[PDB]
Design a protein around this ligand. Structure first.
Ligand SMILES: Nc1ccn([C@H]2C[C@H](O)[C@@H](COP(=O)(O)OP(=O)(O)OP(=O)(O)O)O2)c(=O)n1
Ligand SMILES: [Ca+2]
Ligand SMILES: [Ca+2]
Length: 322
DNA sequence: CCGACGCCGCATCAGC
DNA sequence: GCTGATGCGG
DNA sequence: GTCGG
């Protein structure tokens, strides 16, 4: 939080470019600026000092200059004043509603939560779930709760089949005190890059998590990715825990280290590493690291090996929260 | 100046 | 039905 | 919006 106001300002410009303008690359630009400024270990004294970092260029320089002078950003004060921009922005905070649906909705008269509550009629299933739990999903999850959740997921996965390994990734594996949601990497002997020895491997686990009422809703569900809704059980008389987003990814077992690297993130860490891969002549996805169009996967025994390939020192999870 | 901006699963759509 | 594009979120 | 070449 040394430059919290600067990174906040850049975050919300990024939000605006993603949601309103539908300018995915200006969203990445702004969020890369924000990232590199968030780990800079001095209080930024000027836009000139700021432009010295990679990803801060001329235009963000001038806006950093404006913001320290005055403590605000005209471009943003007027983006907050526009009734249409501020409502499309709000709609995208509903899970399942993005920049396209958000804009379409306001074009139909729909711009408040109340309008959504009246017109669940007009929402696909995901967006209905996103609405249903809109306030819960706005909440963060304390690491203590994450721990209870992980003890449930892992104990229930062991009951299905003992050869399953479940790993919780995301911000939790990076050691954050609070997570936005839960992310579970699953492996099983029967599923490698080479064959799929059994069906329903993901199904069986979700099924069991539904049986004991841990999983409450399904946003989407395929062979290898599950995105749904879970909730901790609560004791007699107590208020109910908030419902929480959960993602399970079944990754072939010999590609664990590429899966856990992907899934540990952060998003911006993933993007910078894969874009640095591209400069060393590689491409990393969540299954393989292949040389460069892609050739054959190179052998991977550990997360560090992926780092060793693109000529990076190893970075423990805790240090990947960019 | 200018390409090129990380990589992908699932849902949905239009075209067939 | 598929295939590819598009949307969305990981 | 930024940047390397
Ligand atoms: N655009 C994205 C989004 C996510 N991920 C990867 C890295 C993330 O860490 C992981 C999980 O997505 P999350 O949104 O849950 O990211 P976090 O766990 O880091 O943040 P939060 O504490 O909000 O849950 O998937 C990615 O590679 N690219
Ligand atoms: Ca998460
Ligand atoms: Ca997640």
């Amino acid at each position: 939080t040394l430059n919290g106001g600067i990174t906040d300002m850049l975050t919300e410009l990024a939000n605006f470019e993603k949601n309103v303008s539908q300018a995915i690359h200006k969203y990445n630009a702004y969020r890369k600026a924000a990232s590199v400024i968030a780990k800079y270990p001095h209080k930024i004294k000027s836009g000139a000092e700021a432009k010295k970092l990679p990803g801060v260029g001329t235009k963000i320089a001038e806006k950093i200059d404006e913001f320290l002078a005055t403590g605000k950003l005209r471009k943003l004060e007027k983006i907050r004043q526009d009734d249409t921009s501020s409502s499309i922005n709000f709609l995208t905070r509903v899970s399942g509603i993005g920049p396209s649906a958000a804009r379409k909705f306001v074009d139909e008269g729909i711009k408040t939560l109340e309008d959504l509550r009246k017109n669940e009629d007009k929402l696909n299933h995901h967006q209905r779930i996103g609405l249903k739990y809109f306030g819960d999903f706005e909440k963060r999850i304390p690491r203590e709760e994450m721990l209870q959740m992980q003890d449930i997921v892992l104990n229930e996965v062991k009951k299905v089949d003992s050869e399953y390994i479940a790993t919780v990734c995301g911000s939790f594996r990076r050691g954050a005190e609070s997570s936005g949601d839960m992310d579970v990497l699953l492996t099983h002997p029967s599923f490698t890059s080479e064959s799929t020895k059994q069906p329903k491997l993901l199904h069986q686990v979700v099924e069991q998590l539904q049986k004991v009422h841990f999983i409450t809703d399904t946003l989407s569900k395929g062979e290898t990715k599950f995105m749904g809704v879970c909730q901790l059980p609560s004791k007699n008389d107590e208020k109910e825990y908030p419902h929480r987003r959960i993602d399970i990814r079944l990754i072939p077992k010999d590609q664990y280290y590429c899966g856990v690297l992907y899934f540990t993130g952060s998003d911006i860490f993933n993007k910078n590493m894969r874009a640095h891969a591209l400069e060393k002549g590689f491409t990393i996805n969540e299954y393989t690291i292949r040389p460069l169009v892609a050739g054959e996967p190179l052998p991977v025994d550990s997360e560090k090996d992926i780092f060793d390939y693109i000529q990076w020192k190893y970075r423990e999870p805790k240090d990947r929260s960019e």
